[PDB]
Every structure is written in structure tokens, then in C-alpha cells.
RNA sequence: AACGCGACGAUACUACCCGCACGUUGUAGACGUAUAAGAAUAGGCUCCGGCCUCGUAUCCUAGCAGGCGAUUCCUCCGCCGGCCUCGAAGUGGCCGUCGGUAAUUCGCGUAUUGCAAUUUAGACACGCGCGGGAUCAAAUCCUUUGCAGACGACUUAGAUGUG
RNA sequence: CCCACCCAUACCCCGCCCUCAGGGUAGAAACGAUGCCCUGAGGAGUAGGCGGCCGUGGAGGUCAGUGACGAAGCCUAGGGCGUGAGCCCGGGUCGAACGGCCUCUAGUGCAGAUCUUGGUGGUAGUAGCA
RNA sequence: AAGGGAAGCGCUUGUGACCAGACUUGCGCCCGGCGGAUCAUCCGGUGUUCUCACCGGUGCACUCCGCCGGGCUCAGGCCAG
């Protein structure tokens, strides 16, 4: 159900309800996803397949740099400056985004965002949170 | 102005324990999920998470909300009521009480 | 030694009597009646009990006790006039007042902070004691993050 | 050292005591277990809803018997010679100072055991 | 559809006493708040002389020495009859049963708090859906009136007033629905050809 | 009904009412807690075209837990006043002002809570605080009375008056 | 008559305890061999039979045992071990002796006996004090 | 703290009150600064289990014994995915 370039619905974590786009499927059940940030605020981040839900909206990935994605897919990209950043955090101010990280998003979200602005109302879909109304049945409704 | 709901769980009601005519077993509880009517509907939610959320008197680590976690194990009967196993048996005062049934781990 | 050991001895006056040949039950009832009262109010009440103007309510040891209208002061029906225990308690309260005067406390603002009646070696005598006093985080990362975001916004 | 030898998890088949019948009703009866010899009483007959009887089925695992939750076995220590006996068992045994040992002898035992790598169950008694 | 609501109001007209009480008791013990109205409009299967005979036997049963305390309090109101059925079906001598009975409410007629609320129906207890057409039935209100309920006429007059007010409300509903129909067609052109066919394809 | 209820008078203290700062305050258990015809069932509804197994329906539902700024919109919502309405255990409408408001589109921010950890967020009730208005009470004991009485209890009377 | 479902200590899988049964373990780098390892089966219980353990007073040997820097005893909404009888530790009190281990010894283990002695309850501030 | 014509007891939660454990880092490698001369080999004596050790001599900068300013690995407590 999940392929490179598929819209996912996060069910847990800080970004709960936030519909995102899965770009690359990693190993041991982890997934590399992104908003894109300019749409719903979700950055280039890795989540769990058991906590995502796969919709059938599939977005085109033509023109997207696979090499750049495969660099973020490495096993120390996110958990690297983690020790230094948290320690440095110790009036409150927003911790700064690794120059490298703010620099990477822009590339991938520029290409992906362009292919999303093409499909009718898709920006609106991705920017909105999924929520459960009254009378809707998760075992019957098709995603 | 979002003026919209923020629910991501399915409502459920802790009804009772798995019991005989006399003997009661607090290990496994009976949960009535909102909108489930039959065993196929139950089979969709087998394996899903369930949380009993209640309010306490003392705030221990920033909140008075305490939660008991468990999972849906197997369907019960023919009416969609499910059996659930929790890390601790439920207080037995929460018969007919609310539980939150979470969709993870997901398979769809 | 006294039962109430949580009161400083420099701020309170203490009175004691042992092997008192007065009824333990009646003395308990009148001590419970005068518990927590001002010294002047308690002395006036005890003198009234002597003069049959006010009655001590019998709460625990009140089997087959005659009724009297004075019981309405306590919302109870069974009241009595324990005259001899009243005299003994008057003597002990006077001893406590003399001790307070010796220590230099203000007798106009003393309350019966502690009063206690125990059984003595056996007729059923009792011990009485009383004390008068002057009346006067391990937060998680997610919660830290949500709180930081709330502080910013 | 501080850490104990690797062991299988310590499981307790029953965490509460086996109180004597009617000990909650009569104060002349202590709570220590006594097997009832009456032919008609439901506790002996094993009727449901009554007190359980001690049995060998509750016996703890052989590899975790006599083990504290830290994984050590308590050895009653009276002096420096006893902790020197306990030398060769740092990871399996802990030292429990006898209740009648004086404070200075306790200080000496604690110093020797800290040199020795041995856990002391009651190292903070008279501090 | 196994839906949970805050409080559900059940219109008691045309409902079998025992079956409705069974459904209500199960809901109360599962944790749903129930408000039953028109207990005088409730129905009992069988014939009226059989129901009256049963109630007269109930009256016969009484405590000797002291009728004031410990005796069977013979409540004559239809709401109390339905409450008696529900209490007999709920374990009232427990804290759980007391909580369920505190979740239950019953009234005669439809009080003004509940006249503007939606009244639901239980098809599993309806007379017209359950009984065979040739079979007899009686009215709990009639039984209560013939055993000593003093307020049949007052409830009847209040129901007449409520029905008149409901007729006025329904004339207003007619006006609103007619205007809604005219408004839909009037903006059926002024909209967007795509949206219209888009909704038709998506089922709206 | 001494653990059923209604109307009214006076309510000193305390703080009676009003607004929010809320509470490390409680709740057999919020998370869209949305939805009023009546009546019949061997019939009914209607705009009078027609329609009715089917509430698997209608409303509402997008936006840092929902930010800031624009083109465009007169739609929805709430608080206060005015006119009336609702009494079965008491409310809604109309007008008006005032505040908010994606039906279309766009821009600038969200990152780091680090792969999940109740999304501490509702209501009523209760309590501490201020700053605005206001109020300024009784009962019991005591004496007396005898329409009352085993004792309590009850009917009476004690403040300048036919005491 | 047909379908699905609920559960007993019953039946099946796994873990652990005990018992019984069947095997292995020396030119010892060898063992509380009264030990250790492997496999299988079994598990209610009156009268009765057998075995192992817990506890008390005193005796011999030993721990070059503990102790006025606090023995024993007692109290504890404080802990740890043992299936259990019981054993060990912490806190408070206290003041002068006591304990573990192998044997010996016996006036050695209590809920009953309308038990013995002593102390103390409800009845009850009641009957009553002519 | 509980209490609407008994209490007391078993299994299992929950609330309140109160506590015993666990951890505080250990092990081994790559660096540098060191402080030192108990590296090896050989010689004489001694004791032993007749080939192993102990003493004194010899041996002093990629040889041995401890510390510091760093880096890496592994093993490390509770609850979990």
C-alpha cells in the first residue's frame, strides 16, 4: 500500500492528523516523509509505517533528486547533532535548524511542491489535518 | 477559525470482565466499540491499541491524567464486542466507562 | 510526660491530677464538653453546672439518661449535672490559670488546647490532664517541547 | 562489583502471606500458618472463596531461590573475617551486618566490604 | 448502528413495557443516559382485564405489621410502573445498579425541556412491529387511571397544548422547507457547471 | 416522605450580586456529546409535480490546538440593549449595535516533541483572590403563659404599649 | 431441524515446584559423589505409616563469635528470604549479658479441656441505695 | 477514613498515604603530556611440585609499573515500540 511518493496520514506523534508525503521506504519499519513544509509544516522527518495510514493519493516524483533523498536516508542524519543541540538548549528561544537541514528541505520541497500545485485542491488536502467525525467507520471507509 | 474536531481514536465502552455465570476474571475486559456490530468489524480492530484515561487527585509528573494501556486481542460473541488485555486489570468501577481505541499499529 | 507532646512548654500552661476519686465516665463527659473552650467560658459553664443552670451533654456514657430542655444547647437530648467532676475540673483549671500567671501569659486569651481523662487503679478513679495555649521536574521530551512551543506562542 | 551475576528473571508465584484461619477474628490466634485438622472446615476441604493452603506448588525457582531483587544472596556478616570469607563471591552474595554489631565494627566492616567489592544491605544504619 | 449519545429520549408510545425495559436496562448498565417519555402511552401485551388482575394481585401483596416501612409501595403512576420493570431488570441492590437507576429518568407526557428535543424509537419493542394484528393490547395509562392515578386529565390537556404548539412549529417548518427548495433551484444555475456535475459524479 | 416538592419574607457577619486570575478542587466517566411535528400501520407525506423498505439521512466539518498579511465576499457566529415571547421541573424569536468570520486565490512563518507514549484543551458544581454595587438578620437558652404536657415538644408574652 | 457463540480446576501447548522412575559422571584439569548433568511420568485425601525440616530450656566442642561506641527483651500505616512452620535487617525503648554451627539431653511447641491462676470488658453510670 | 436493618474473609484493580531495590559507570584499544625503573635475557644464592619461582646483580625512551587532557568499542537500570 505504501510506495515512494504516496500520501500518508500520521496517527501519532506531534504531527498527528497531519497528511504528509512518503518519499523513501527505509529498513526495519521506518519511513522518510516530508510535508512538504511549505504546505502543512511537517519537515523532512522519519516516522513509523505501523503508525502511518496509506491513502491511495499517489503524487508524481518526476524531477525529484533521488540522490538527495538517499543522503537523508543514512543512519546518522537526524540523530547526529541531537546530543549537542539538546545540551546547548540549556527567555525561551526556538532552537536553530542545522544549516544543512534548512538547506536540504528547500530542494526537495521545491520539486515536490511543484508537482502538487498541479493537482486540483491537493495543497488544501495536504495542509489540512485528518479528523474523525461522527458516524464515520474506520473499518468501512476507504482511504 | 478551524472550528473542527481533533479526534483520532474510536470511542469504546468498558462493559465488564470475561466472566462465567458466577466466576469473574479481571485479566481480560469486554469492550464495546462504537459502531462495531459483527465479527468482521471486530476483526478489523484486532490488535489495535486501547487506553483507559482517568483523572486523579495528585499531579505526579505534570498532569492529573493517568492512563492504562492495552490491546484488543480477539472478538467476543457475534455482536462485535471485543476482548481486550491491559497491562493492569481495569478498576472494576469503570464498568460502562469510556476507553479510547487507537488505530495503531496500522495495516491499511 | 503528658500525651500532647507537640506543644512547646514555654508558650503553654499545663495542669495535672492523678488518682482523683471522681467518676471516670462523668469526668470524661464534662472534659469533652469543655474541650477547646476559652478559660473564662469554661469556668462560667462549670459554675453553672454546679448551680444547675447549664447541663453537660452525655454522649458516650449516657445509658438511660433523663431528658432536659438545656440539651438544646448541644442538639442532644441526654444531659446531666456532674457536679463533683465539675468541681475537680474547676480546681485543675484554676491550677492551670495560676501556672499561666506565673509564666506570664495573658489569661484573657487562653484556650483549652488539650484535655484528657484516663482510668486510675481501681470504685473507678481517674487521672486528668490539660494544656492551655495562647490562641492565634522529571518531564519528558515531548512535554518539554509542547511547553516551549506554548511559551513562544 | 556493584552489578550482580546475570540471572533469569526473579518470579514470585505468590507475594502475600498464608494467614491462619480465624486469626482475623480472634486476637489470641497469631497470623502464622497452621494447617486446620478439622474434618468439616471449608479451608481444609478447599472450598472456593476461602483461604488457600501452602503447598509445594508455590515453590520458587531453584536458580532464583534466596535471591534479593538485586540478584544477591544474603550472607550474615559479623566481622572483617566474615567479609574476607565473602571475598570470592562479589557478584552472587551480599553482606548483611548482624544487628548486635557495634557502630565502630560496622564502620570497619563497611570499609572492608567497599574495598572488597561486596554489597552491604545495611550500610547506612548508624550514619 | 451502535451509536453513543449523551442522552437519548425514547418516545414511549406504542412500546411494549417489558421489551422496552429490557433494552433500557441494558443501555443503562452499558452506560447510556435514557429519558423515557409518554409512559402513559406505553403498551402492555395481553388484554386489559389480565393486566388489571395482575396489578390487583400486586396490591394484594402487602406487609402486615407495618405498611409504612418494609412494605411493597404500590406506585400507581405509569412512569413508576415502567420504572418498576426497569428496576426489576437491573441489580438495584448494588452500587452499579444504583448508578444505572440514577442514569435513568422517566416522565408522564413530554415536559417542556424535552418537547423541543428529538424523541427516538426502539423498533425492537414497538407494538405495530412486534404483535400479531389480531392480538389484544392494553394501555398503561388506562391501567394507572383505573388503579388510582390522579392526573390523567392534566396530562391529556398538556399533551393537547403541546400538540397545538407543535402544529404551529410544523407550519413554520413547512415555510422553511419550501423556501429551502426554492433557494436550491434558484442557485442551481448560479454556481459552476463543474461543481454541479462533480457532485453528481461523487454522489451528492 | 423527618435523604419528595413549590411560593414568599428577612438575611448581621461571612461576603449577597457583577467581570476575570484562576484553581497542582471535584464529578458511575465531553472530545461535533448537533438533529422537536403530530398521527396511521389493511397506510401516510406533500411545494399538489409527485414521493414513501433503507437516519448507511440532514446540518456542520479546511487555516501555528488553527499564526500574520492581501484580492474577493455579504454568509455564518457570539455578547450586550429594545419589543415581545416561553410556567409540565420555565426560553426562544425579531430588530439594533458591537466583535469575530476561506465562497476564490496567494505570500511569509511551523522544523528539534528527534521513529509512538491521554492531542493536561468541555460543562456544571465548589474554593482563593482583587475592583464595582449593595445589605446591615434571626433562632435557641432565660423569665412568663396553659388552648399543652411522662420528660422533651406545642400555643402564648417580654423593646414603652389595648405591655 | 440448522448456524454461530459463552465457560469448569475438564482436555491440548508452554513455564515453574516437588516426588518417583530410568541413564551418565576417576590411571581425578577433581566432588557441600549426602554433589552435579540428561530424559520421562505423576501431583485430592480421613484413620494410619514413613521422611525432612522450624522452634524452646540446659550440657560438651567450636566460631582466637557478638556486646555499656549498648546483650537480651519489647513496639513498629519500614523492609528482605523461605511453599510453610519460621529466619534476617532498619527505626524507637532499654540496660548486662547473648548467639550461629556439630553432637547430647528434656518438666521442649496450645484455641478449646463448663481447664488453673491473674488481669480486664459489655451489660452500666443500669437495677438499686427499704 | 468508612457507615440506608451486621461485621470479619478470598481474587483483582483504582485512589490516598508511605517505602525497599536499580543507577551514579566499569572493560579494553588509538593519541599526547608525563612521573618512575620491578621490561626481556643472562649471572650467584635459596625453596620447591626437577622445572618451576623468589631474592641480589644486569638491563633505563617505540621495553615495563600508575596519573592526567582527549577519542573509540563493548557491557551496563526501568518501561516500551
From TrEMBL, chain A:
GO MF, one annotated term: structural constituent of ribosome
Residue ranges of the TM segments: none
UniProt entry tagged with the keyword Ribosomal protein: yes
Keyword annotations from UniProtKB, A to Z: Ribonucleoprotein, Ribosomal protein
GO cellular component assignments: cytosolic large ribosomal subunit
Annotated region described as Disordered, given as residue ranges: 90-102
GO process annotations (BP): cytoplasmic translation; ribosomal large subunit assembly
Family the entry assigns: Belongs to the eukaryotic ribosomal protein eL6 family.
Name of this protein: 60S ribosomal protein L6
Positions spanned in the full protein: 51 to 200 of 200
TrEMBL record, chain B:
Pfam families: Ribosomal_L35Ae
Highest taxon of source: Eukaryota
Entry annotated with the keyword Transmembrane helix: no
GO cellular component terms given for this protein: ribonucleoprotein complex; ribosome
Protein name (Swiss-Prot/TrEMBL): 60S ribosomal protein l33-like protein
InterPro entries: Ribosomal_eL33, Ribosomal_eL33_CS, Ribosomal_eL33_sf, Transl_B-barrel_sf
GO molecular-function terms, A-Z: structural constituent of ribosome
UniProtKB/TrEMBL annotation, chain D:
UniProtKB keywords: Metal-binding, Ribonucleoprotein, Ribosomal protein
One term under GO cellular component: cytosolic large ribosomal subunit
Entry similarity comment: Belongs to the eukaryotic ribosomal protein eL32 family.
GO biological process, any: translation
MF GO annotations: structural constituent of ribosome
Protein name (record): 60S ribosomal protein L32-like protein
InterPro entries, alphabetized: Ribosomal_eL32, Ribosomal_eL32_sf
Pfam families xref list: Ribosomal_L32e (PF01655)
Binding residues annotated for Mg(2+), in chain numbering: 40
Membrane spanning residue stretches: none
Automatic annotation (TrEMBL), chain E:
InterPro entries, per database record: Ribosomal_uL13 (IPR005822), Ribosomal_uL13_CS (IPR023563), Ribosomal_uL13_euk/arc (IPR005755), Ribosomal_uL13_sf (IPR036899)
Keywords for this protein: Ribonucleoprotein, Ribosomal protein
Molecular function terms, GO-annotated: mRNA binding; structural constituent of ribosome
GO biological process, one term: translation
GO terms under cellular component: cytosolic large ribosomal subunit
Superkingdom: Eukaryota
Similarity comment text for this entry: Belongs to the universal ribosomal protein uL13 family.
Protein's job: Component of the ribosome, a large ribonucleoprotein complex responsible for the synthesis of proteins in the cell. The small ribosomal subunit (SSU) binds messenger RNAs (mRNAs) and translates the encoded message by selecting cognate aminoacyl-transfer RNA (tRNA) molecules. The large subunit (LSU) contains the ribosomal catalytic site termed the peptidyl transferase center (PTC), which catalyzes the formation of peptide bonds, thereby polymerizing the amino acids delivered by tRNAs into a polypeptide chain.
Protein name (Swiss-Prot/TrEMBL): 60S ribosomal protein L16-like protein
Organism: Chaetomium thermophilum (strain DSM 1495 / CBS 144.50 / IMI 039719)
Lineage: Eukaryota, Fungi, Dikarya, Ascomycota, Pezizomycotina
Amino acid at each position: 500500500s505504501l510506495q515512494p511518493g504516496t500520501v500518508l496520514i500520521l496517527l501519532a506523534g506531534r504531527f498527528r492528523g497531519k497528511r504528509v508525503v512518503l518519499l523513501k521506504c527505509l529498513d526495519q519499519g521506518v519511513l522518510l516523509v516530508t510535508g512538504p513544509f511549505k504546505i502543512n509544516g511537517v519537515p523532512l522527518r522519519r516516522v513509523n509505517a505501523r503508525y502511518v495510514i496509506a491513502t491511495s493519493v499517489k503524487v508524481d516524483l518526476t524531477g525529484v533528486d533521488q540522490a538527495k533523498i538517499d543522503e537523508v536516508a543514512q543512519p546518522k542524519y537526524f540523530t547526529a547533532e541531537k546530543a549537542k543541540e539538546k545540551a546547548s538548549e540549556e527567555k525561551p528561544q526556538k532552537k536553530p535548524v542545522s544549516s544543512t537541514r534548512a538547506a536540504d528541505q528547500k530542494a526537495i520541497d521545491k520539486a515536490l511542491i511543484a508537482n502538487i500545485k498541479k493537482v486540483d485542491m491537493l495543497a488544501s488536502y495536504l495542509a489540512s489535518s485528518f479528523s474523525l467525525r461522527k458516524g464515520d467507520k474506520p473499518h468501512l471507509m476507504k482511504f | 477559525p478551524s472550528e473542527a474536531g481533533h479526534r483520532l481514536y474510536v470511542k469504546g465502552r468498558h462493559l465488564s470482565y470475561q466472566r462465567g455465570r458466577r466466576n469473574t476474571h479481571p485479566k481480560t475486559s469486554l469492550i464495546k466499540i462504537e459502531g462495531v456490530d459483527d465479527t468482521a468489524a471486530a476483526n478489523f480492530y484486532l490488535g489495535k491499541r486501547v487506553a483507559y484515561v482517568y483523572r486523579a487527585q495528585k499531579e505526579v509528573r505534570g498532569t492529573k491524567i493517568r492512563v492504562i494501556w492495552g490491546k484488543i486481542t480477539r472478538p467476543h460473541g457475534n455482536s462485535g464486542v471485543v476482548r481486550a488485555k491491559f497491562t493492569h486489570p481495569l478498576p472494576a468501577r469503570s464498568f460502562g466507562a469510556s476507553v479510547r481505541i487507537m488505530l495503531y499499529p496500522s495495516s491499511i | 510526660r503528658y500525651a500532647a507532646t507537640e506543644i512547646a512548654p514555654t508558650k503553654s500552661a499545663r495542669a495535672r491530677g492523678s488518682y482523683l476519686r471522681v467518676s471516670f465516665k462523668n469526668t470524661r463527659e464534662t472534659a469533652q464538653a469543655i474541650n477547646g473552650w476559652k478559660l473564662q467560658r469554661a469556668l462560667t459553664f462549670l459554675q453553672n453546672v454546679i448551680d444547675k443552670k447549664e447541663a453537660v451533654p452525655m454522649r458516650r456514657y449516657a445509658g438511660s439518661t433523663g431528658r432536659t430542655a438545656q440539651g438544646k444547647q448541644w442538639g442532644v437530648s441526654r444531659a446531666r449535672w456532674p457536679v463533683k467532676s465539675a468541681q475537680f475540673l474547676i480546681g485543675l483549671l484554676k491550677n492551670a490559670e495560676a501556672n499561666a500567671d506565673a509564666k506570664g501569659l495573658d489569661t484573657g486569651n487562653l484556650i483549652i488546647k488539650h484535655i484528657q481523662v484516663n482510668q486510675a487503679p481501681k470504685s473507678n478513679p481517674c487521672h486528668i490532664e490539660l494544656i492551655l495555649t495562647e490562641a492565634e521536574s522529571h518531564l519528558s521530551s515531548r512535554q518539554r517541547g509542547v511547553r516551549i512551543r506554548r511559551a513562544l506562542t | 562489583m556493584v552489578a550482580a551475576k546475570k540471572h533469569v528473571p526473579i518470579v514470585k508465584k505468590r507475594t502475600k502471606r498464608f494467614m491462619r484461619h480465624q486469626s482475623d477474628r480472634f486476637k489470641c490466634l497469631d497470623s502464622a500458618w497452621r494447617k486446620p485438622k478439622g474434618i468439616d472446615n471449608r479451608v481444609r476441604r478447599r472450598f472456593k472463596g476461602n483461604l488457600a493452603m501452602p503447598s509445594i506448588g508455590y515453590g520458587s525457582n531453584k536458580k532464583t531461590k534466596h535471591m534479593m531483587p538485586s540478584g544477591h544472596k544474603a550472607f550474615l556478616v559479623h566481622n572483617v573475617k566474615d567479609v574476607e570469607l565473602l571475598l570470592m563471591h562479589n557478584r552472587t552474595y551480599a553482606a548483611e551486618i548482624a544487628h548486635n554489631v557495634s557502630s565502630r565494627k560496622r564502620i570497619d566492616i563497611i570499609t572492608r566490604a567497599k574495598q572488597l567489592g561486596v554489597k552491604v544491605t545495611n550500610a547506612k544504619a548508624k550514619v | 448502528m451502535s451509536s453513543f449519545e449523551s442522552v437519548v429520549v425514547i418516545d414511549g408510545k406504542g412500546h411494549l413495557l417489558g421489551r422496552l425495559a429490557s433494552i433500557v436496562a441494558k443501555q443503562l448498565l452499558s452506560g447510556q443516559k435514557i429519558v423515557v417519555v409518554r409512559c402513559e402511552a406505553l403498551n402492555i401485551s395481553g388484554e386489559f382485564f389480565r393486566a388489571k388482575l395482575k396489578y390487583h394481585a400486586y396490591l394484594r401483596k402487602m406487609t402486615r405489621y407495618n405498611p409504612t416501612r418494609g412494605g411493597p409501595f404500590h406506585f400507581r403512576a405509569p412512569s413508576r410502573i415502567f420504572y418498576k420493570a426497569v428496576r426489576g431488570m437491573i441489580p438495584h441492590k448494588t452500587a452499579r445498579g444504583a448508578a444505572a437507576l440514577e442514569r435513568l429518568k422517566v416522565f408522564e407526557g413530554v415536559p417542556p425541556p424535552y418537547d423541543k428535543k428529538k424523541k427516538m424509537v426502539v423498533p425492537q419493542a414497538l407494538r405495530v412491529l412486534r404483535l400479531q394484528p389480531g392480538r389484544k393490547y392494553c394501555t398503561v395509562g388506562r391501567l394507572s387511571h383505573e388503579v388510582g392515578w390522579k392526573y390523567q386529565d392534566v396530562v391529556a390537556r398538556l399533551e393537547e397544548r403541546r400538540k397545538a404548539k407543535g402544529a404551529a412549529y410544523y407550519e413554520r417548518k413547512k415555510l422553511a422547507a419550501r423556501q429551502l427548495s426554492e433557494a436550491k433551484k434558484a442557485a442551481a444555475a448560479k454556481v459552476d457547471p463543474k461543481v454541479s456535475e462533480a457532485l453528481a459524479a461523487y454522489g451528492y
